[PDB]
Design a protein around this nucleic acid. Structure first.
Length: 69
RNA sequence: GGGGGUGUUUACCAGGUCAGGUCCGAAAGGAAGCAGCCAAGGCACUUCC
């Protein structure tokens, strides 16, 4: 369950804004994402790292559930 | 080494363009700019000098 699938699914607009800023490797293997990338991703989608962490946390909560069925 | 070609590779660290998103502005409109692509670089093969 990659960030892409998570993207399939008015604040939601900002969630996308943030995923459309990652690379295909990022969208595919989220963990590789750390400070540096975050800095690029947020600033790329006019967001703050927190928003990214926010989304990143969201996705996590999401993936987790998936890995339970 | 240089020119040409082919395959491959490359998050950000003063190339270009800029979906999405952001910023400034009452507006009209300005600004920066991620991914992408183009470009460019790296690893080679080929061909010419």
């Amino acid at each position: 369950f990659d960030l892409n699938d998570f993207l399939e699914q008015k604040v939601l607009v900002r969630m996308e804004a943030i995923i459309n800023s990652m690379t295909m490797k990022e969208r595919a293997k989220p963990e590789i994402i750390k400070g540096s990338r975050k800095r690029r991703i947020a600033a790329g989608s006019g967001m703050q790292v927190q928003d990214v962490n926010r989304l990143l946390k969201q996705f996590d909560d999401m993936q987790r559930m998936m890995k339970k069925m």
